[PDB]
Write an enzyme that holds these catalytic residues in place. Structure first.
Site, PDB file in Angstrom:
ATOM      1  N   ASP D  21      43.597  39.088   9.096  1.00 10.32           N
ATOM      2  CA  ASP D  21      43.126  40.449   9.360  1.00 10.32           C
ATOM      3  C   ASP D  21      44.021  41.363  10.228  1.00 10.32           C
ATOM      4  O   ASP D  21      43.746  42.563  10.276  1.00 10.32           O
ATOM      5  CB  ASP D  21      41.705  40.381   9.973  1.00 10.32           C
ATOM      6  CG  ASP D  21      40.759  39.393   9.277  1.00 10.32           C
ATOM      7  OD1 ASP D  21      40.498  38.325   9.876  1.00 10.32           O
ATOM      8  OD2 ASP D  21      40.307  39.723   8.159  1.00 10.32           O
ATOM      9  N   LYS D  24      49.289  41.715   8.396  1.00  6.75           N
ATOM     10  CA  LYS D  24      50.534  41.039   8.011  1.00  6.75           C
ATOM     11  C   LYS D  24      51.115  41.516   6.672  1.00  6.75           C
ATOM     12  O   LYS D  24      52.326  41.394   6.487  1.00  6.75           O
ATOM     13  CB  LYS D  24      50.365  39.514   8.025  1.00  6.75           C
ATOM     14  CG  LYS D  24      50.176  38.982   9.452  1.00  6.75           C
ATOM     15  CD  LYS D  24      50.095  37.455   9.504  1.00  6.75           C
ATOM     16  CE  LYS D  24      51.422  36.790   9.131  1.00  6.75           C
ATOM     17  NZ  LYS D  24      51.353  35.327   9.272  1.00  6.75           N
ATOM     18  N   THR D  25      50.278  41.959   5.722  1.00  5.44           N
ATOM     19  CA  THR D  25      50.731  42.552   4.464  1.00  5.44           C
ATOM     20  C   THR D  25      50.760  44.090   4.498  1.00  5.44           C
ATOM     21  O   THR D  25      51.601  44.691   3.824  1.00  5.44           O
ATOM     22  CB  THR D  25      49.878  41.988   3.314  1.00  5.44           C
ATOM     23  OG1 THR D  25      50.472  42.324   2.079  1.00  5.44           O
ATOM     24  CG2 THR D  25      48.416  42.458   3.325  1.00  5.44           C
ATOM     25  N   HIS D  84      46.205  32.442   8.170  1.00  4.28           N
ATOM     26  CA  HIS D  84      45.160  31.427   8.254  1.00  4.28           C
ATOM     27  C   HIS D  84      45.802  30.028   8.223  1.00  4.28           C
ATOM     28  O   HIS D  84      47.024  29.890   8.127  1.00  4.28           O
ATOM     29  CB  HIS D  84      44.060  31.682   7.207  1.00  4.28           C
ATOM     30  CG  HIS D  84      42.777  30.894   7.398  1.00  4.28           C
ATOM     31  ND1 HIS D  84      42.036  30.312   6.366  1.00  4.28           N
ATOM     32  CD2 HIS D  84      42.148  30.649   8.588  1.00  4.28           C
ATOM     33  CE1 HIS D  84      40.993  29.716   6.964  1.00  4.28           C
ATOM     34  NE2 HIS D  84      41.041  29.889   8.295  1.00  4.28           N
TER      35      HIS D  84
END
Lengths: 86, 205, 62, 393
Positions: D21, D24-25, D84
């Site tokens: 969340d 990162k993208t 994650h």
RNA sequence: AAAUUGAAGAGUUUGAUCAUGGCUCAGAUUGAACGCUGGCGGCAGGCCUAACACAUGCAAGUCGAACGGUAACAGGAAGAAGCUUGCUUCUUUGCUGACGAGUGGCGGACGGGUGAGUAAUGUCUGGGAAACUGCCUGAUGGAGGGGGAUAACUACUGGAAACGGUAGCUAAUACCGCAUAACGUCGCAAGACCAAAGAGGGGGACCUUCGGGCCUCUUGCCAUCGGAUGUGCCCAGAUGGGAUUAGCUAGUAGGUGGGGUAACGGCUCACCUAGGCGACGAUCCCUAGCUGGUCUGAGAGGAUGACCAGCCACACUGGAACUGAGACACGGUCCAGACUCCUACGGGAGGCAGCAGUGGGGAAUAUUGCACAAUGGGCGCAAGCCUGAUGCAGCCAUGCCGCGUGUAUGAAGAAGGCCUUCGGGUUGUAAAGUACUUUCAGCGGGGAGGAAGGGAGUAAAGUUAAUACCUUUGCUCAUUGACGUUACCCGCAGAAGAAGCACCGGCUAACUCCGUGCCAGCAGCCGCGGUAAUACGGAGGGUGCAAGCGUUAAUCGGAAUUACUGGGCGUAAAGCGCACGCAGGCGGUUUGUUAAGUCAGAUGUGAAAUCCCCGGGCUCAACCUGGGAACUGCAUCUGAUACUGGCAAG
RNA sequence: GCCCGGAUAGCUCAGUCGGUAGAGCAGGGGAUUGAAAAUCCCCGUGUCCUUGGUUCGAUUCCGAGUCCGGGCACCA
């Protein structure tokens, strides 16, 4: 192979195809005058019709319209029909 | 291709001298002639009809030092040739460059003569031949290259060729370092130490 | 096919993908094949030095 | 027939780190978006900020630095990787592959567990060259509370001996830089200002004998089998003869292509990711346990002697001693391999926070020499770091 | 430049033996693979599986010397303007070099690839009679005149693109009619009827718009009859299996008339008659490109058609038609089918069984090579252009051969291993050492031939316009290599960089030790192995082969094991249970006569390549190649008639 | 690269998913044999996943990894 770099020899062929059709069917339907004069019983009207035909019967094979040695045999066959009449 | 391993091994197995490795051991210490190879070398030799055939073929191929593919080749060539096959194959064996160089005293052994040939030493008809399987022609002359006239072993070999008879189809001159292959190789002068029929009888099996 | 496997040491399993040559051995019923050692999922035989071309074991090493 | 990437200025491989969340993208889209406007000269365009299905399909992020672009000192490619614990393998290898990393945190969350895991990697396997970005700043009403949100990061930096205030911590709102807000497009490109100077600069081992430890492999239609990854050393040109060593039989090929980011490449360079097409190779035979290299420079081994330090619980290492007869996962550049380990005469255990000499025995060979680094892991943590002291046969 | 060297045995049934008989097997070969090993070079070879599907590239065009044009590029020429200033910008000008594109002619139907179909009216071999043509060539003649169209272009204009649309202009070796026609064509003959092209080079004279005309030369065209390479048709023989493969046909068979054809025929329409075809094999279903020839074996015989080459079919699938000398065509057209792909949603595109490349299948297969150098091929008036055609390096022990890996020498044999009777024996002159040389590979230098023709200049001769033009040849010197730092040569260290693999119970050459103890496995068969195993595993030593080695499969030999070559059948597997008897096979003996069979004879033919005979050359070989022989037969015809056959008589 | 399942005596089946793991089928030793079969008398196997952890206690719980089967996923 599957392809060639030109396609144009096919279009030169269609241009020729349509210009052959446009006077090959002309020279072939005049024959109805010989057959109608054969059907009329009369040797003289048969001959006049075939005499209209000789101009186109030699010329169609001299020229490209059916080409090759097809004039000799057609001119011979048509005499060989109208000489059955009297 | 050449035999690289222990050379008196062969002579002991075939019970003969094969005219290779022609040196000597001091005071004949463990000179190990007239005995068979290995730990079981003390056994008395046993025969069969297939053993005699295989051993006569080994004998001739150990004489002239030739591979099995080479001998199988020469035997096909021999059978192509007119006359009797046995003598036709032996003529092939007697004409080949390395063997004619041993015959002319230039090599005191077959392997000295094949090493001489490897090192571009011989010209024949005045043109260089550096390979073992060139057939020397009648009335031609073999001539040592100047860069090969320096091998101390060849100059010695021509002395080791003295009081050793040479085939009557050639003459050689030590002083020139040149030998005339005077005439055609002659089956009426030289043969192998075997029966030529038995060594080709086994090919039919 | 049933196929004989030569020399001791068995790396093969009930889905190991392998090659087999002819091996005639009428001593064992129906067996006309032999499983090629050191090919596909088949490894070579253990503690061998006399075979190299056989048993898939290669030339012995230092 | 295809277009060519032209090797002017140096070019380097980097990547995002932190928790899920956090952005990162989002960041990797948004940085590339303002750079193409500001460095590249373009006007804000919709096909700049969204991208086609076809690129997503191959640059799947987790195998490819899927965005490649240019800045005034170097070209950069940049990788997006999972925040994650369900997948970490490509992060922990990507750490040994990068010259530095982009630490992403969302001001709304603060640091989360994978933000505390990924920071250690620059000490453990990679390089301590980290640049930081604080996302979703625009949501916080008060700058002095944004500062307390940021004081979590200065503590985390200082936990793994990164300077808490001499690290560059940019403020931004990446979803607003992405869409085209005038203030946040103007508060993302600050990050490339630091990236051009914090490294300070990448450096390439392009004098050396060619060494490509393969990371991953592709099957190009009509052309065959490509092997790709960071080149660690040396140089390549198209038509060179090449040797593949590692988990397989040693074989020789011709590099008959060389590309980077689906463009032709005049030269494969050290310190950067390069792809190589190979003569007489099938996608069936090759494996990631391979290393492409200059012929006769390195050979495969399964066994080796080495020095290894066992981490202390300070660094998140063990608190239990590390016994003999262990089965750790090792990490070498682009590749992981597992081996069984051994300790010196009468040593049953080495304590946490101590160095020992060890002999390993891998479950498959890889190409190896002395001076090659590793880390060991037992799952939930890395537990040691070490170096190959000599190879064994 | 002739000619042969070719024919085998062995293990295994029982207590022992003879005979019968299967099984295993030595040998050769394959577009072969597998597993180990591997240094160097030549020449040869690399889907032999899915006709299974291919991303991407690249592969038939070309001629300004048929025509209209001038996009591009340079130039000239001329205009205009400026210290870019006697050098330079901008413009114009088909005016010239020249050429994008258009029109037009000829060729793309050749090469190259694939072997799916097809037991074939295709193919092979040998003949028959009603045929025809690119283009070359022999010979003879000719070239009148006019019209008409239209792309490029011009303007206008739709669609995302494919694709274009509307209207206008006009040239030819293009288009079309007429003219005009032979030894032509048809017609029994009278007679009637049919064609066509120019272009280009160049000069004294002569016209002249100075364009052009006229001329001549050269080249091309058209008509017609001959020749010729090429091609078509027809006919006989030959062409795998299933008879548990027995009926098939009128869509035929035969004829007549018409049609059609280059010609020919149920080609095709129609009628009339009813026939045709089959068990000496119709029909039906299965398999399968053929052949020259390749392999194997004394050959017969078998396998077999692959690498090369002659012929045939095919090109993602199915239907049709056409352009034309020639093509339901690989490279092309319409239509359909399937899949796949693009798309602005309206719409469109495509088929490596060319070449390189790829995925897939499978036991298994090169580099999106390189090149104008030389050869063939297409256009080319020629210069020139085209070409994945062509040549040639790369990759790989895939094929065959050649070469090397050291050699000469060398011990109180010394360490070590191995075996031991403990004496020694042996590995082994093997090692070390001593001596020599470096071939090959290495590094450096040098360096042949594939190169002929072709370019330009120039001379003389011929053609001719007195004249150029044009052309034959000579001469000058201009020029041409991919492969490639070439082949090959020369220098220079230095043994330096080059041995592994299987085998040792018997068949089968090779023995000893140790462990194992019916175990591990071990062989192809017979078999081995259950604690003194040349049969296992290891060891050493030995045998054999060698940069290759072993093993498996496949084919052929051995096999006479389906016996013409070359067998048995009382009983070794085996003679019909018996008779009668058609089909078919077989038939005494003599006279005449005949000549289908047989036999002699001759002529034509089966190309190359392959074999043989005898050479030549690349150093030799592998390899390449010359000359000479080879080709059992077939077609047609001449001779003979002993004999078998026929016919007639007895 | 990700996700799922499989590591009790040679075999099978049980067993507080923490408290010396039990039984059967098969097998080993001894006798008999030169050996084997058969018989007669004695007796053993647990890689109770490797390896790290949690705990007072791991067979049984939790991470790691290896091999094997199955799923999901990409084309410089």
């Amino acid at each position: 192979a599957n392809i060639k770099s030109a396609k144009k020899r096919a279009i030169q062929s269609e241009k020729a195809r349509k210009h052959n059709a446009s006077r090959r069917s002309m020279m072939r339907t005049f024959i109805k005058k010989v057959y109608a004069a054969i059907e009329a019983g009369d040797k003289a009207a048969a001959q006049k019709a075939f005499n209209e035909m000789q101009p186109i019967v030699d010329r169609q094979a001299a020229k490209g319209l059916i080409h090759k040695n097809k004039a000799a045999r057609h001119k011979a066959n048509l005499t060989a029909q109208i000489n059955k009449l009297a | 291709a050449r035999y690289l391993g222990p050379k008196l091994k062969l002579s002991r197995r075939e019970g003969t001298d094969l005219f290779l490795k022609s040196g000597v051991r001091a005071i004949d210490t463990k000179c190990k002639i007239e005995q068979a190879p290995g730990q079981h070398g003390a056994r008395k030799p046993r025969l069969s009809d297939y053993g005699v055939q295989l051993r006569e073929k080994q004998k001739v191929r150990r004489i002239y030092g030739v591979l099995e593919r080479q001998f199988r080749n020469y035997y096909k060539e021999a059978a192509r040739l007119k006359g009797n096959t046995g003598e036709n194959l032996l003529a092939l064996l007697e004409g080949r460059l390395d063997n004619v160089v041993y015959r002319m005293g230039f090599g005191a052994t077959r392997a000295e003569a094949r090493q001489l040939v490897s090192h571009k030493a011989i010209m024949v008809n005045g043109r260089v031949v550096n390979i073992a399987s060139y057939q020397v022609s009648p009335n031609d002359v073999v001539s040592i290259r100047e860069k090969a006239k320096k091998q101390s072993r060849v100059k010695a070999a021509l002395e080791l060729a003295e009081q050793r008879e040479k085939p009557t189809w050639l003459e050689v001159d030590a002083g020139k370092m040149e030998g005339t292959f005077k005439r055609k190789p002659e089956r009426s002068d030289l043969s192998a130490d075997i029966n030529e029929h038995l060594i080709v009888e086994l090919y039919s099996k | 096919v049933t196929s004989y496997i030569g020399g001791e040491g068995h790396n093969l399993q009930e889905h190991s993908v392998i090659l087999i040559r002819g091996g005639r051995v009428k001593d064992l019923p129906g067996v006309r094949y032999h499983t090629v050692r050191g090919a596909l999922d088949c490894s070579g035989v253990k503690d061998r030095k006399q075979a190299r071309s056989k048993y898939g074991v290669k030339r012995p090493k230092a | 027939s295809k277009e060519k990437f032209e090797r002017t200025k140096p070019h380097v491989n980097v990547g995002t780190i932190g928790h899920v969340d956090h952005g990162k993208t989002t960041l990797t889209a948004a940085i590339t978006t303002v750079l193409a406007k500001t460095y590249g000269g373009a006007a804000r365009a919709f096909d700049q900020i969204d991208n086609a299905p076809e690129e997503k399909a191959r640059g799947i992020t987790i195998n490819t630095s899927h965005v490649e672009y240019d800045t005034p000192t170097r070209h950069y490619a940049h990788v997006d990787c999972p925040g994650h614990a369900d997948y970490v393998k490509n992060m922990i290898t990507g750490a040994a592959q990068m010259d530095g990393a982009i630490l992403v945190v969302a001001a709304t969350d603060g640091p989360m567990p994978q933000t505390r895991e990924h920071i250690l990697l620059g000490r453990q396997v990679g390089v301590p060259y980290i640049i930081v970005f604080l996302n979703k700043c625009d949501m916080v009403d008060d700058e002095e509370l944004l500062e307390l949100v940021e004081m979590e990061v200065r503590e985390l930096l200082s936990q793994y001996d990164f300077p808490g205030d001499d690290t560059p911590i940019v403020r931004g709102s990446a979803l607003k830089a992405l869409e085209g807000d005038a203030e946040w497009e103007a508060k993302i490109l600050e990050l490339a200002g630091f990236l051009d100077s914090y490294i300070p600069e990448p450096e390439r081992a392009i004098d050396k004998p060619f060494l490509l430890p393969i990371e991953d492999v592709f099957s190009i239609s009509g052309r065959g089998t490509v092997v790709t990854g960071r080149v660690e050393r040396g140089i390549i040109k198209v038509g060179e003869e090449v040797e593949i060593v590692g988990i397989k039989e040693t074989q020789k090929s011709t590099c008959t292509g060389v590309e980077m980011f689906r463009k032709l490449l005049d030269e494969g360079r050290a310190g950067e990711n390069v792809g190589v097409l190979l003569r007489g190779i099938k996608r069936e035979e090759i494996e990631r346990g391979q290393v492409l290299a200059k012929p006769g420079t390195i050979k495969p081994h399964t066994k080796f002697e080495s020095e290894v330090y066992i981490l202390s619980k300070d660094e998140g290492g063990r608190h239990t001693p590390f016994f003999k007869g262990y089965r750790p996962q090792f990490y070498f550049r682009t590749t992981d391999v597992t081996g069984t380990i051994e300790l010196p005469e009468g040593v049953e255990m080495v304590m946490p926070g101590d160095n020992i000499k060890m002999v390993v025995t891998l479950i498959h060979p890889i190409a190896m020499d002395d001076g090659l680094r590793f880390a060991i892991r037992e799952g939930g943590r890395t537990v040691g770091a070490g170096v190959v002291a000599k190879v064994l046969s």
